[PDB]
């Protein structure tokens, strides 16, 4: 079934990343300043599905940020969400840059990676 199976796992991953990002970007969080102190590491090259290893190794720091992201208006399930992400990556599946990334940049980078691979599969 892999023709639309791989495309669908990538779309599920994309929606999870996008939901986290929208939640951060839309609603006013009093903890935003603390969320922005969190340091994420970025792959040097992320072009193929193999490079999703580089995502898995930052899931522990991501889960922590997700605790900070819940509010009165943005609701989430950090543990379930991280588990789904780990599943999809481990199925569809590393050297970093010197530059650290914020959660916002981290999410945007991985969202764009997904969108490129998904444009390939259409």
């Amino acid at each position, epitope marked *: 079934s892999s023709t639309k199976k791989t495309q669908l796992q990538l779309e599920h991953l994309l929606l999870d990343l996008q939901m986290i990002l929208n939640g951060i970007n839309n609603y006013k969080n*009093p*903890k935003l300043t*603390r969320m922005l*102190t*969190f340091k994420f590491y970025m792959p040097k090259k992320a072009t193929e599905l193999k490079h999703l290893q580089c995502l898995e190794e930052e899931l522990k720091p991501l889960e*922590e940020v997700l605790n900070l992201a819940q509010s009165k208006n943005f609701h989430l399930r950090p543990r379930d969400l991280i588990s789904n992400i780990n599943v999809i990556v481990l199925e569809l599946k590393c050297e970093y840059a010197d*530059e650290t990334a914020t959660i916002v940049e981290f999410l945007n980078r991985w969202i764009t990676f997904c969108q490129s691979i998904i444009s390939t599969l259409t």
Partner: antibody
Amino acid sequence: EVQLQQSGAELARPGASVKLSCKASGYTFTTYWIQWVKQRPGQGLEWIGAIYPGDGDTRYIQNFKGKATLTADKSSSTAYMQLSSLASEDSAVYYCARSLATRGFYAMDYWGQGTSVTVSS
Amino acid sequence: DIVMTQSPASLSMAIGEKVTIRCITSTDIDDDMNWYQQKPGEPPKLLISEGNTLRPGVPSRFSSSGYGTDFVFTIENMLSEDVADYYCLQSDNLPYTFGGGTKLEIKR
């Protein structure tokens, strides 16, 4: 095990600068924020700012922007705080201390022993 | 910023009595409260971290409660080893900020 050793007591004349140090052992010096805290004699604790040594990024409370300058040497596992334009209300004990988890701001568990700065003619 | 008002500034308690210190936050910190103990000439020691988490090695008669803006630190029964200053620290947003502290002395 995890240890933070601060430099010694300093005396400085009003207007000079001083550079305190904090040498860290027992953990990955690069993935933990290090916080700096001022304590005037007989008074309360006072948050100054923080540095992530992995890349030199810094945070400051507003009215210490310019007074304090945080730096780090990753080779030596050492952090530094420059204080500039010293007045008397800068006479205080300054601690460094490590956030209790990686990659992010947290409260501090491992503390230096403190460095006392006196600012007098 | 978020200010934290710690109260009382001073407290004296007979041995084995229960001790209560309060921190009130100028905004909603969602349980991001921490409690430190400082004895003279020493650096402050983290007693309780956010989520009412007792630190490893800390005596069990230390406890804390609170979610939102009103937080309480509790010693179940005063021992003389507990004479010290106690400070709370919010770790919810920047800037980090400390309460003004509490001087805890024993009665005799």
